[PDB]
Each structure stands twice: as structure tokens, then as C-alpha cells.
Design a binder for this molecule. Structure first.
Ligand SMILES: [Zn+2]
Lengths: 74, 146, 48, 148, 49, 144, 48, 148
């Protein structure tokens, strides 16, 4: 029916980001209190992200689990 | 002490290039020089790279751009690769004949390294006299732009 | 007549509860209000 | 030794009947997916308009339901399942309502699927279920509901 | 604190696809690993951020 | 009859087959079918591949790591990949909900568990909680 | 029966203890939680 | 005048046996290099799934172990040495366990290397070690462990 026509749409899409630069990359701490010995731990990084509009890839294929959500047990 | 560790990346005609910047705070009585060098063994930095194999590189061994501490992931057109087929010696990579004409791609971890580009707030001073036989001069921490 | 006693519990266990996402719909709704105090300027004083 | 059957609240599916009840002035009860569960009434007297309230309970002598004007939408009635206040109540919040299809364990250690056709409760509050293809009644703990 | 304030998100690492043409140093237009982009991705990982 | 499906019941057998290194095929609900594998070499870890079709001169399976959960294995259907038949051409597959009339002409809902056929392709179905067979016409698919 | 007495120490000396570095591994883990209070806005009040 | 030999906890090396114990429902105990030491159990009843707990102690009447669902990974079992709860315990945290190779001082003032083959403790808690190539038992203070 719409062989020669112009179709216009409004759509909802899932949000996506990619990493353009890493800001305040590595932050550190020699945690020692209440430990057998000194330990090194990496504190949170900060990321500068950009949205994917010029190139778009579909959402990743995640392996599903058979566990039913909101399951009642007894 | 180090602050604001930054991995600034520039995408260019020549390729991608890393121009990171960071700020350091030092101990007392230490005088630093322009283009000095620091390295942090404890901290590891991830990188990715790809190399093309030919009949000559296979024998010589691939010259790696970055350094190496350990490898994380290896793959080619044939899929992943296993420890039985690849080995690394002196920061160059050797492969068996199975991958004579193939493109190998890697993800790698490397140790962190910095060099001194400029010295900021170089010299700070104090005439410490309290609880001393006599006056003494001491150099307070410098700040470094790496 | 009989004394009121608490009795035993009745709530069964639940595992892996999924969060609730608001559903998109073009239909109308009613926004549930809160009736309370309101803040405003004293516009008469501002003129002064 | 049990209480008589307890009826489920029937959602009203057709718009025409809903308006007809509304014109008579019988109260409706609408569940909004996003915001809340509300009552709907057409105003008494000659000054006709639609009214909405959130005083969800029977009009007790000490519980006066309060109404406010609202421009109810036709699409709201259509999309959202609606009930008559005289049925929808706490009197029954059965886990598996009537016409629900469930998986139940049979004597032969086989799990068959059947629909609930009658509901009644003992004096202790346990709901007895009548199932298609079965004579006796079944207990809630024995049953399983398969979703999707 | 991070888990408290963050939002649930899927995380996938990035790596250059083998499909890169060795001579031009640029990728194939359409292959399963990357759909024209010069970079492939690993299986997703779940994280709060 | 047809033997297109040979589901594995015990996960212990699945692990045993995995130790043998044979590829598996795991079903998913409203999602693509997947293959699973144990890695060779010194380090043993689970690998997955989204490629279902058979290995060929024009088609090579792509394998990658993953932290697979036993919960998917123990619950979802599992098969030996090479032994799997792609489809069984019947109107209502197994575990499909249908409405049927019982022997006393009273209507009940049921799910299907049977595979029987003559040599012409005429199929019969036996319903869960039932004994006798039911034809393609007698059964009626129950809409979601 | 016998009285409880503290006794002597048992911990031997250790010298040049090396710090612990977390090992990289592609394998899964479980993040040990802390169960406590949580902070949230009052989104109903925000609408007001 | 000493206590009978005390056995070391055997790490389970093969995946097949570990799953077999898990299917029977016998509890496992896994040490994670990064985060913690945890117990693993397959859920009782028909609702089958894997469960994880951090209540690392014997199920005393006053110590109820609590379980939560978790999607345990196969690779986690393979890489991390795992034990059966019935063995891994504070009953023995011997400094040098069985099958450990140590350097021990001999009567001729020569330090020879030998493996520990049997372990027992006196009533005072001192561990007696039996060594290959030697008849008598050896004391912890006398020994030295060479690493790498
Ligand atoms: Zn590609």
C-alpha cells in the first residue's frame, strides 16, 4: 500500500556509551589496617564517554540464566 | 605522591597516540632534573595492538611497540591462541609456522612510566631553628608535571 | 473472647526479585499529589 | 466444614457497559499502571462532570470519601482494566484467581496443567481449588503457576 | 557506595578485529565480529557504574 | 516414531561429556541457540560460540571465553550438537499448550509430550496428564 | 578445672613483609557485600 | 604420649567429582584469590539452583548458616582450589602440610631435603613430622622450607 510514500517515525532506543578518554585514571592506597600485611588496591577511575550515533551496533548477546525471576520458595 | 593521572589520547593521521599528564609531589631534599624518569612497577596499564605476520617476521620475532608484563588475550582469524604455540623473549614475540600469513591481535598489560616535562613550584624553603643547635636550611617538596 | 496472640509468620521467601520499570503509554494518567505548605516571595515587599 | 465459595472481581472489558454504570452513578475503580489505583464517579446533582478520588475503602461512617474534578480520558478506561467497587475488595486477594491455568502434581507423579474453576476457603483461610479434569479440590502449596 | 549510587550496566572490552586489511590498515565493511567498525568487542560483563 | 531429540537429564553426564571435549548445544527462551565447549591445552575453561551451522570449508566456528553458570545448564535443555536434528516438522511442538476435549466431551487445557508418526507423515499427540493420542485437528493451540 | 591463665606469647617475628597485589584473572568472583542503610531522594516530594 | 595423626584437607582437583558431590548436596568450600573464602551448595528441594554463603563455621545450634542465590561459574571451580567442608577446618593449620618438601638439619651437620609423609601432634600441640629417608620424627623449629 505504501509503495511510493514517505514514512516518518518516532522511536525509543537503549542508551550506549563508548570511552573516548580516561580522566584521573589510577588512584591508589596502601591499605594496611586490620590486614595480615600491606595490600594495594585500585580506587575508582573516571571516564569521559561519548554517545554512539555515527556508528551503531546492536546490544550484546548476553548468556541467559534459566533461573526464573521473582521466584517464590518454600 | 601522584595526582590527576590522565591518559589523553589523540586520534591523528599518523594514528592514535597517547599524551598523558600527571602531577607529582616528592620528598624533602630531593632535586629533580628535566626529563628525569619514573616507573611504577605495581601499577599496570592496559593496551591493545595488532600486528601482521609474514614469512620473515615469523623467524625474526615480532618487535613489540609497547613493553610487556603479561598477556591477557590473543586472537587471529583462526580464533584464539594457546600457550603451546606462542612465546615471548626479550620483548619480542615468536610464533609457529601455523600463522605464517595471518593478522594477530592482542590485549596486554604494561607497567606505568612517567618522565618529567616541566618542574612546577620547584623550590620551597624553610629556616628550621626550633629545637636545633643552630639554624638549618631544608628543601620542601617539589611539584612535578609528568 | 479468646485472647489475641501474635501467631506465626506468613510471608514466604522470594529470590531474584526484578526491579520495576515504568511502562511507556500514550494514555492519560493522574499524578498523585502531596498537599502541604507552599513557599512564595513577598512581592509587595519587593516593590518597596 | 468450610466457607462458601468466594467470587473473584470481574474486570469490565467493554466500554459501553462501563459508561452505562457511570451514567447511573455507580462507582468505578481503575488501576493505573504508573501512578495509582483510583475511584471514578460522575458527579451527583445536575452539575454533571467526572470526579476522581483516592480514598480506597468502603464508605464507613468514620471514613468519608472525598472527590475532586478531573478530566478522565476515554483511552485511560480502555487500556486500564477497571472494576466495580462493590466487588474489588480485600475480601479476596487469592494468589491464583479463577480461570488461571496452573501446573499441579497428580497422584501418578506427573505434573499436569489445569485451570481453576471454583474457589472456596476453609475456616483457617486456606483456599481450595477445583480443577478441570479433577474431582477433588487442591491446595495452594501443591500448585505451581507457569508464567509465559 | 558505588553500588549504592550507580546504575546497572553491561560492560564489553574492545580489541582490533582480525578483519583489518593488512595493506590499507582498514577494515572490512561487514563481518560478524564488527559490522563495519574497525574494532571488535568481547563478551559482555555485568557491572554497576 | 522419531528420535530427533535426546535430552540430557543429569548434569554429571554433561560434565563428563565436557571432559571428553564433545560440543554441546543449549537452548534459550526467546533467544538464539548457543554452543558450549571446554577449552583444550594447559588451561581448562569454558568457551562459547554463537555459530550453530556445521564446520565447513566456507564456515568456521568462532569460540570465546565466558563465565558460564551451572544454573543455565541444570535448567535449560542440553544436547550433543552433532546428534541434534534441527527441527521436527509438526504443528504443535512438545511442551506447547493446547486445548482439548476430554473423553466426556468436557474441555481441558494440556501441554504436549509425544512423537509418533506413520511412514506417510501423519502425526499423533499424547497430552500431559493423558494416555490416548490426539490428532493435529483435534488439538487447538492456546494463545498466550 | 584448672584456673585459666594467659600464658606466654606465640607469634614469631617476621621481617621484610611484602605487600599483597591483587592477581589478574578472567575467572568469575563474588564481591563481598555490606548490608546497611541506603540513601535516596523523595521523588514524590520532588514532583511537588 | 601423643595425639593420633591429624589429616590434611585434600583439595579436589577434578571437576567431575566436585559436581558429583554438589549434585548429592554435600557442601563445598571455595577460596577466591581476590575476595574471600566461601561455601557452595545446591539448593534443597525441587527448586534447584546454586547457593553461596560466607558463614564459615560448623552449623552449630546457635550458628545458623544463611544462603543466597548466586550464578557460580565453572571456571571459578576449575582455577580455585576447592575443599569439602567436612575436612577444611581450624582443627589443623599446620605450618608445613603433608607432601611438603622441606630442608632439615641432620646429625652430621648436613642440611638434606625431604618430604613430610606423616603428621601428628603431642598433647602440647607441637607437630611431629615423619620424613622420607628418616626413621624418627622431626620438630617444626628444626625444619626449614625452601620456596622456589
Ligand atoms: Zn571485523
Amino acid at each position: 500500500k505504501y509503495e511510493n510514500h514517505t514514512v516518518t517515525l518516532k522511536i525509543l532506543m537503549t542508551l550506549r556509551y563508548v570511552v573516548s578518554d580516561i580522566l584521573k585514571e589510577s588512584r591508589y592506597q596502601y591499605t594496611k589496617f586490620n590486614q595480615p600485611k600491606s595490600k594495594f588496591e585500585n580506587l575508582p577511575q573516571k571516564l569521559l564517554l561519548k554517545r554512539e550515533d555515527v556508528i551503531v551496533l546492536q546490544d550484546p548477546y548476553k548468556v541467559n540464566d534459566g533461573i526464573e525471576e521473582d521466584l517464590e520458595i518454600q | 605522591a601522584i595526582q590527576s593521572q590522565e591518559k589523553g589520547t589523540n586520534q591523528l593521521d599518523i594514528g592514535i597516540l597517547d599524551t598523558g599528564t600527571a602531577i607529582g609531589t616528592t620528598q624533602l631534599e630531593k632535586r629533580i632534573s628535566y626529563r628525569d624518569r619514573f616507573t611504577v612497577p605495581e601499577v599496570l596499564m592496559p593496551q591493545q595492538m595488532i600486528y601482521f605476520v609474514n614469512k620473515d617476521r615469523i623467524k625474526k620475532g615480532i618487535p613489540l611497540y609497547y613493553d610487556v608484563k603479561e598477556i591477557t588475550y590473543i586472537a587471529t582469524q583462526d580464533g584464539t591462541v594457546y600457550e603451546e604455540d606462542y612465546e615471548i623473549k626479550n620483548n619480542r614475540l615468536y610464533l609457529n609456522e601455523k600463522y605464517e600469513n595471518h593478522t594477530v591481535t592482542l590485549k596486554i598489560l604494561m607497567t606505568l612510566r612517567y618522565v618529567v616535562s616541566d618542574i612546577l613550584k620547584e623550590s620551597r624553603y624553610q629556616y628550621t631553628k626550633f629545637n636545633q643547635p643552630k639554624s638549618k636550611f631544608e628543601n620542601l617538596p617539589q611539584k612535578l608535571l609528568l | 473472647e479468646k485472647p489475641y496472640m501474635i501467631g506465626a509468620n506468613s510471608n514466604p521467601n522470594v529470590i531474584n526479585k526484578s526491579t520495576t520499570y515504568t511502562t511507556t503509554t500514550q494514555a492519560d494518567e493522574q499524578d498523585k499529589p502531596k498537599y502541604t505548605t507552599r513557599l512564595e516571595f513577598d512581592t509587595i515587599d519587593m516593590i518597596r | 466444614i468450610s466457607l462458601n465459595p468466594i467470587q473473584d472481581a470481574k474486570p469490565i472489558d467493554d466500554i459501553v457497559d462501563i459508561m452505562t454504570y457511570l451514567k447511573n452513578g455507580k462507582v468505578l475503580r481503575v488501576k493505573q499502571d504508573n501512578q495509582g489505583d483510583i475511584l471514578v464517579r460522575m458527579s451527583p446533582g445536575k452539575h454533571k462532570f467526572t470526579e476522581v478520588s483516592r480514598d480506597l475503602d468502603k464508605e464507613s461512617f468514620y471514613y468519608k470519601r472525598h472527590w475532586v474534578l478531573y478530566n478522565v480520558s476515554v483511552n485511560s478506561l480502555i487500556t486500564f482494566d477497571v472494576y466495580l467497587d462493590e466487588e474489588y475488595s480485600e475480601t479476596t486477594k487469592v494468589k491464583y484467581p479463577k480461570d488461571t491455568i496452573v501446573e499441579y502434581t497428580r497422584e501418578d507423579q506427573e505434573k499436569d496443567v489445569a485451570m481453576i474453576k471454583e474457589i472456596l476457603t476453609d475456616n483457617n483461610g486456606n483456599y481450595f481449588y477445583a480443577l478441570i479434569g479433577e474431582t477433588m479440590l487442591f491446595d495452594e502449596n501443591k500448585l505451581n503457576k507457569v508464567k509465559d | 557506595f558505588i553500588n549504592d549510587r550507580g546504575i546497572k550496566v553491561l560492560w564489553e572490552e574492545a580489541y582490533f578485529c582480525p578483519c583489518l586489511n593488512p595493506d590499507t590498515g582498514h577494515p572490512r565493511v561487514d563481518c560478524p565480529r564488527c559490522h563495519g567498525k574497525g574494532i571488535a568487542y568481547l563478551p559482555p560483563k555485568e557491572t554497576i557504574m
